[PDB]
Design a protein around this ligand. Structure first.
Ligand SMILES: [Zn+2]
Ligand SMILES: [Zn+2]
Ligand SMILES: [Zn+2]
Ligand SMILES: [Zn+2]
Ligand SMILES: [Zn+2]
Ligand SMILES: [Zn+2]
Ligand SMILES: [Zn+2]
Ligand SMILES: [Zn+2]
Ligand SMILES: [Zn+2]
Ligand SMILES: [Zn+2]
Ligand SMILES: [Zn+2]
Ligand SMILES: [Zn+2]
Ligand SMILES: [Zn+2]
Ligand SMILES: [Zn+2]
Ligand SMILES: [Zn+2]
Ligand SMILES: [Zn+2]
Ligand SMILES: [Zn+2]
Ligand SMILES: [Zn+2]
Ligand SMILES: [Zn+2]
Ligand SMILES: [Zn+2]
Ligand SMILES: [Zn+2]
Ligand SMILES: [Zn+2]
Lengths: 493, 493
């Protein structure tokens, strides 16, 4: 795939020193970064290349651009199959009758638990062609917003359809399976077992076997538990044994909601982080989604275990979640030295991407502390790249522009009014830009996106296949009448 | 003449926060005549005089969202400080940044001293520098959909900003800089810096000059820079001026954690109580920030039916804690005080109204665990109708209703961010911003189309601004040409 020199722009590395190079350069050979730094230092690396390699060198003039490492979104859910029903296309245009529901008002724990336990049934209701079309468009939207490495933490989609989508798109993907074996029902004093733990674990073992063979280096997998509410002691024990035996990372959602601790005590006799700790899951392998509603003992367990938190401050308000300011635990654990990364979470229609989440962290963590240095723009970038990659156990290959790492990078245009006179274009990007301002996306030295358009894929073709799949799934599986769906899709066209 | 904008989703920000899918706006000359469902507005077109119904300009807005023009009632022209104020001369790396100025609770001595130096710098800029910088600064607000702009104290010449607004075709509430005290660290009491009567005479001169304006686009509103820099005589003088001429009034108060202690030490009393003693806590008051208020001061604001302008998009990067440290502004909004959203300002482009609406939607909802506390339509009302009420301009602007000025925005809704969403304002708050404003109409006149000036050339405004900034920065701020010329030499086009 040959050599590429990207020169002249401001280069953000997200390396250990959070290095920024004005008039910087990145030299890539095949899939790897070979040199990054001042243009003059990188030109010395170009002159050291084999003559046959230097002769094929592609020079990209990035003088009116900012270069970033590819975003690593380690906490994401494929949910686009629910685009008509889940807070989606059938809502009234007026928001005035909206109610506090689902995750809002501290969490409707019965409704959340019941909803999560229904995923297996809905996944089985979609065809493999519907699953592939929805996955490919959903994952394209992440790639288009600069996500080069995507982490599944439990999707309403078929795992191997999402793996096939990632293979076709050219992006990196950490695949998972849906894992729920208990429900918290309103008529009961105790959790109701819905599945055999061994069956849930066999489903992940099948995925692990299928991606073990992948030759691209772009596909990994990571087991998750959907939510500690929907987790038996047997599933927790089984997950601990699986991640030890196969040397894997582990993910779950825990301390996500004000009402979680009381539901966990009532139905399981113990709170989320303590149940994980008794199974041996609170350790360096753990990425905890949200992880804000933790008492002092649970905070100390996370610190002692050197666990990881994925935080989604771009999307809490619109869900009615209070996982930032009600406890202030995640910023406090970050100050105490816990690894904290930024993720999008997900929804059934496009929501905040990584770029929007970086802005949210920069605004919100700094405002809470009355400190513009708590999250610097380069910290928000590290939290969406290098630190995220560390939580996913992919920081061997991705998350920073350093020699020997994968050539995964973004170009953003910096020639318009938003960037004028600013020596810190990442700051202008966090003020006034977002996902739609990502211009070029390169993964393993291959250009996947240029001018905001697919190079090897057509967004228009992915959209058409996604809409066709959504029509089939929505009318057949969700039982929304074709008479209500077809007119909406006809007005897109 | 008559213009019909039809087919899109129309947000009115009327008293019911009305949203019309497949809506229309009919304008005749400068005014809205009908707004509602496209079919209802076509009946209004048929009820027009036939000569008017003939010569109707039809704008197909079927793939667009229509909004009222944004009303940014709390803004400062600060672009003259682009080289020194968190500006163009900073290192590209942010890693050495320190907590300064407004951060860490507020450096009250430094803030007071800084504000008291504005008059000197305003006198140092030429009328031509003032006009060029004002016109570009105010263009950036217009390009981001601001149709009505409120000056709350600028580092610029008042008549230059009035001339800039007249030239651009936007609405402007002009003010003068007002500071007559400084908090000096070597003294136990405030130091009087100017005669109150002289400060008031400067505003009286502006009021006289804009009294004659025939456009209906120019008003004025006196402000006090900050209650730290305000003598009892200036407050009493302002109260008499706004009563005699029936004007609104604006100031910054309760902005910083360290304000109350500095106000007690140097003035013997906190900000809102000092305003109440002068008779300024009433329906005319727009209080900037207004978060660090005790229970008695909150009750004074409620009793007075005063107004708060909140800038949650920009607190974090300034190290301000005017949202979460006290929670007072969301609490006063819940209690039924008028609260609007504003950008505040900086010396380089920062968060516009679109970014501030997103911030409010995320941040107020997250604090309350309530996705309904600020609905997207509430964020819009806070940036339009409610802002106009605080500025006392809601007679003519802030909502799309019959008899109001034809001030509106068109945003394209045909890309991936909007696909299948019956609530394009929600998609706009998730994933769009100032740069996604397509068309801006003021009094029925198109000023911006496709994000470009219709009557003005953005490239020409930029070059005049850069020429003026070079002169002012080297001559008045005493930055060597050797530091300025290289930055200007790098400017993209
Ligand atoms: Zn270096
Ligand atoms: Zn050297
Ligand atoms: Zn219940
Ligand atoms: Zn087994
Ligand atoms: Zn293995
Ligand atoms: Zn095995
Ligand atoms: Zn136990
Ligand atoms: Zn504590
Ligand atoms: Zn999640
Ligand atoms: Zn590692
Ligand atoms: Zn530059
Ligand atoms: Zn001092
Ligand atoms: Zn002069
Ligand atoms: Zn003049
Ligand atoms: Zn001093
Ligand atoms: Zn008078
Ligand atoms: Zn008068
Ligand atoms: Zn007094
Ligand atoms: Zn109180
Ligand atoms: Zn202000
Ligand atoms: Zn309300
Ligand atoms: Zn009014």
């Amino acid at each position: 795939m040959g050599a590429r020199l990207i020169t002249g722009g401001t280069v953000y590395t997200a390396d250990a020193q959070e290095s920024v190079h004005a008039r910087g350069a990145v030299l890539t050979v095949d899939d790897k970064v070979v040199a990054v730094g001042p243009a003059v230092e990188v030109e010395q690396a170009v002159q050291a290349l084999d003559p046959a390699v230097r002769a094929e060198l592609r020079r990209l003039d990035a003088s009116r651009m900012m270069v970033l490492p590819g975003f690593v979104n380690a906490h994401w859910h494929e949910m686009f199959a629910m685009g008509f029903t889940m807070r989606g296309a059938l809502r009234p245009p007026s928001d005035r009758a909206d109610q506090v529901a689902f995750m809002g008002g501290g969490g409707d724990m019965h409704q959340i638990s019941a909803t999560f336990d229904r995923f297996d049934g809905l996944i089985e209701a979609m065809t493999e062609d519907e699953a592939r079309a929805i996955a490919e468009y959903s994952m394209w939207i992440q790639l288009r917003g600069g996500v080069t490495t995507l982490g599944d933490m439990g999707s309403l989609n078929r795992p191997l359809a999402m793996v096939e989508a990632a293979r076709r798109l050219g992006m990196r993907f950490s695949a998972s399976t849906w894992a729920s074996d208990a429900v918290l029902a309103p008529d009961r004093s105790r959790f109701l077992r819905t599945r055999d733990a061994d069956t849930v674990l066999a489903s992940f073992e099948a995925l692990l076997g299928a991606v073990a063979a992948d030759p691209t280096g772009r596909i990994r997998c990571r087991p998750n538990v959907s939510y500690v509410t929907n987790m038996t002691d047997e599933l927790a024990r089984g997950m601990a044994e699986l991640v030890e035996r196969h040397d894997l990372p582990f993910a779950t959602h825990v301390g996500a909601l004000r009402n979680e601790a009381d539901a966990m005590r009532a139905y399981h006799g113990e709170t989320g982080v303590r149940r994980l700790a008794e199974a041996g899951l609170v350790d360096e392998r753990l990425m905890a989604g949200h992880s804000a509603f933790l008492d002092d003992q649970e905070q100390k367990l996370m610190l002692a275990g050197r666990a990881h938190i994925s935080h989604s401050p771009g999307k809490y308000g619109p869900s009615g979640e209070s996982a930032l300011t009600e406890t202030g635990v995640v910023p406090a654990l970050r100050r105490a030295g816990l690894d904290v990364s930024l993720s999008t979470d997900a929804a059934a229609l496009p929501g905040a991407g990584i770029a929007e989440t970086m802005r949210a962290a920069w605004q919100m963590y700094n405002e809470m502390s009355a400190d513009q240095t708590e999250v610097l723009p380069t910290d928000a970038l590290a939290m969406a790249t290098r630190i995220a990659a560390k939580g996913l156990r992919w920081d061997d290959a991705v998350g920073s522009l350093e020699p020997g790492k994968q050539a995964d990078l973004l170009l953003v245009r910096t020639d318009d009014w938003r960037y004028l006179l600013n020596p810190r274009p990442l700051e202008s990007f966090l003020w006034l830009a977002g996902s739609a301002d990502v211009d070029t996306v390169i993964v393993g030295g291959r250009t996947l996106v240029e001018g905001g358009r697919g190079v090897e894929v057509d967004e228009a073709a992915l959209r058409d296949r996604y809409l066709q799949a959504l029509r089939g799934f929505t009318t057949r599986a969700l039982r929304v009448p074709a008479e209500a769906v077809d007119p909406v899709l006809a007005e897109v066209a």
